[PDB]
Structure formats: C-alpha cells, structure tokens
Amino acid sequence: SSVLVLGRISDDPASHYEQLKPLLDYVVPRMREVGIRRGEILMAPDARQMSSYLRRGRVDWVSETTGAAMLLEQRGSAHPLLMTERGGLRDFHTLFFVRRDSPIHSLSQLRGHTLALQNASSTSGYLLPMLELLRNGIACDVLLSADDTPARGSAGYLMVGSKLNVAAFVHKHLIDVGALSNVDWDDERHMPPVFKRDFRIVHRTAPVPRAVEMVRTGMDPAVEQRLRVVLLQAASDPKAGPALKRFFDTTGFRPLDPTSRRRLQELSAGVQRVRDHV
Structure with a gap:
C-alpha cells in the first residue's frame, strides 16, 4: 500500500x-x-x-x-x-536458425529434427516458436535429453535455458535448430559472431x-x-x-x-x- x-x-x-x-x-x-x-x-x-x-x-x-x-x-x-x-x-519476432551445412531449409523440415528452446516464460524463445509450430501443424514433442530423438514425422524440443545456450548447442552440432528473437540475433553476447557465421536463418514468425x-x-x-x-x-x-x-x-x-x-x-x-x- x-x-x-x-x-x-x-x-x-x-x-x-x-x-x-x-x-x-x-x-x-x-x-x-x-x-x-x-x-x-x-x-x-x-x-x-x-x-x-x-x-x-x-x-x-x-x-x-x-x-x-x-x-x-x-x-x-x-x-x-x-x-x-x-x-x-516497438515490435520483435522469432527466427529459427540452423548450421549452414544442415539439410534444413524451411520450417517444414524441422520434422525428424531437434529444436533448442529457452524456458517456459520466454516470448521469443519458447511461446512464439511453439505457436509457429502449431500453426504449421508440426508436432513438437518434449525430448528428455540430448540423446533422445523425435518421432520420425515430428519435431522434438530441448530446454537449454539461456539464449547463449541456444546458440552454443546448435553451433556445436548438439541440437539441429534454435529459436531466438531478431534482436537476439544482432546481439553479440547471445549470438557470438564466431557462431553466427556458421548459421543460416530458415524461418521468421510474424511480429x-x-x-x-x-x-x-x-x-x-x-x-x-x-x-x-x-x-x-x-x-x-x-x-x-x-x-x-x-x-x-x-x-x-x-x-x-x-x-x-x-x-x-x-x-x-x-x-x-x-x-x-x-
């Protein structure tokens, strides 16, 4: 009071x-x-x-x-x-990124592959990418560990916590796809240029x-x-x-x-x- x-x-x-x-x-x-x-x-x-x-x-x-x-x-x-x-x-949006050498070129090809997300309260690193998957009918089951694999046909997601972890897990071939905000992408503490140069963007959400x-x-x-x-x-x-x-x-x-x-x-x-x- x-x-x-x-x-x-x-x-x-x-x-x-x-x-x-x-x-x-x-x-x-x-x-x-x-x-x-x-x-x-x-x-x-x-x-x-x-x-x-x-x-x-x-x-x-x-x-x-x-x-x-x-x-x-x-x-x-x-x-x-x-x-x-x-x-x-005023606005921002989510992007999905892969290693350049990845076979993945579109959101629809997340099927059979893993996705790094942040935490359940993240707008750009969880809520918006999950929503995107729903809109495109892409099943995305929770995976229990980086050894776990998705169904053939579905994506699977792994919770890595930090924004830096999303970049670092994907850079190091541990997880196929990452979700970050467009702001996060041009921010060097979470998307180190040493990783970024090895990434390509494969999908953008609406803002x-x-x-x-x-x-x-x-x-x-x-x-x-x-x-x-x-x-x-x-x-x-x-x-x-x-x-x-x-x-x-x-x-x-x-x-x-x-x-x-x-x-x-x-x-x-x-x-x-x-x-x-x-």
Missing part, C-alpha cells in the same frame, strides 16, 4: 536486479502524492510464482515481453498499463509488440493512473535517461490503443493455445 513493488520473471535475478532499481528510484519519489513512500524489487523464477505474487499483492508492477505478460494476464493476476518500446523497437508494463489486478486506481503518468513522461525527462537505459534499454512507453489491444488479444489466444497443447 505504502510500498511500490517492481519485478519481472527472471532466470537471472543477479543481472536483472540492477536493471530495475534505477528506474524504481526515479519513480518512487514521483509517487508520494498518491501514498507511495518506498519501493522494493521482487522477481520470480517463473510465470506461476509471479502470478501468485501478483494476486497476493506482493508485486505491483512488472515489465515483460508480451508473451510472458499474457501468461500473467491469463491467470487473472495482472493487466496492461502501457506498451513498452526497447532499443528503439508481436516488444514489451508491456503490467500492473497487479486490485491496484488502487490513483496509484495505477499516476504510475502511468510518471512512466509516460519519463522518456522525455533528462533525469530518467540513465535509468531507462538500465531498464532493458527502454526508449519509450505509450498508452494502449485499439491496435495494441487487439494484437495482445491475438497473442493471448496463441499463448493459451501453446499452453493448451504443452
């Missing part, structure tokens, strides 16, 4: 912490006029724990990619505050909005309204520049409109379909 709790779903609380605190310290002062005296960070390992936190009022505000955000909205636990823009981009600020359901409306106003004016405030750079390189927030509302409804439909089948 008197505390504002910011978080996100995170498999790396050590890095993500420092990405959240600066913006929080910018925001908290500017909320005094609606009750807020202080702030805390509270991350969670997955969507299900974050969702519990949200419903129990232990977290108030999260910044998420849009697939992950819909996982939270589906469980009744949060709703969108603003659309968020990162690295100058989705890049990210969204979500707030817990039950948030007091004047707190909600004011958090919205504080973030909206942050992009243009010099005093917020460093914090926004730290906050996953956020370069803009904007209100919701009929388009972004529709596109999240579509993406939520797809996410639910991924969840219905996995």
Whole structure:
C-alpha cells in the first residue's frame, strides 16, 4: 500500500536486479502524492510464482515481453498499463536458425529434427516458436535429453535455458535448430559472431509488440493512473535517461490503443493455445 513493488520473471535475478532499481528510484519519489513512500524489487523464477505474487499483492508492477505478460494476464493476476518500446523497437519476432551445412531449409523440415528452446516464460524463445509450430501443424514433442530423438514425422524440443545456450548447442552440432528473437540475433553476447557465421536463418514468425508494463489486478486506481503518468513522461525527462537505459534499454512507453489491444488479444489466444497443447 505504502510500498511500490517492481519485478519481472527472471532466470537471472543477479543481472536483472540492477536493471530495475534505477528506474524504481526515479519513480518512487514521483509517487508520494498518491501514498507511495518506498519501493522494493521482487522477481520470480517463473510465470506461476509471479502470478501468485501478483494476486497476493506482493508485486505491483512488472515489465515483460508480451508473451510472458499474457501468461500473467491469463491467470487473472495482472493487466496492461502501457506498451513498452526497447532499443528503439516497438515490435520483435522469432527466427529459427540452423548450421549452414544442415539439410534444413524451411520450417517444414524441422520434422525428424531437434529444436533448442529457452524456458517456459520466454516470448521469443519458447511461446512464439511453439505457436509457429502449431500453426504449421508440426508436432513438437518434449525430448528428455540430448540423446533422445523425435518421432520420425515430428519435431522434438530441448530446454537449454539461456539464449547463449541456444546458440552454443546448435553451433556445436548438439541440437539441429534454435529459436531466438531478431534482436537476439544482432546481439553479440547471445549470438557470438564466431557462431553466427556458421548459421543460416530458415524461418521468421510474424511480429508481436516488444514489451508491456503490467500492473497487479486490485491496484488502487490513483496509484495505477499516476504510475502511468510518471512512466509516460519519463522518456522525455533528462533525469530518467540513465535509468531507462538500465531498464532493458527502454526508449519509450505509450498508452494502449485499439491496435495494441487487439494484437495482445491475438497473442493471448496463441499463448493459451501453446499452453493448451504443452
């Protein structure tokens, strides 16, 4: 009530912490006029724990990619505050990549082969590629280990965790295909040029909005309204520049409109379909 709790779903609380605190310290002062005296960070390992936190009022505000955000909205636990823009981009998309020497030239040829995915909360590294497979009728069974092979006829996926692991498992001939975002592709820490030069892109998904600020359901409306106003004016405030750079390189927030509302409804439909089948 008197505390504002910011978080996100995170498999790396050590890095993500420092990405959240600066913006929080910018925001908290500017909320005094609606009750807020202080702030805390509270991350969670997955969507299900974050969702519990949200419903129990232990977290108030999260910044998420849009697939992950819909996982939270589906469980009744949060709703969108603003659309968020990162690295100058409103949208992003997933691409599937193989080694150049691979026989694979199209999504349809994932059949008989393995796919590296990230973790169940990743928009670009799990939700969107699984959705893509569903749309194309490509069965994709979970594989238990890198020794396990798919059915002849189906793809199979292996959860490798990190973005770097997706690149490194495929580079080293351990798994046939990898899924990463288009942003991830041009980012050298997750797609090292030494691996990239040995990869070829074989499929692209349709884009989705890049990210969204979500707030817990039950948030007091004047707190909600004011958090919205504080973030909206942050992009243009010099005093917020460093914090926004730290906050996953956020370069803009904007209100919701009929388009972004529709596109999240579509993406939520797809996410639910991924969840219905996995």
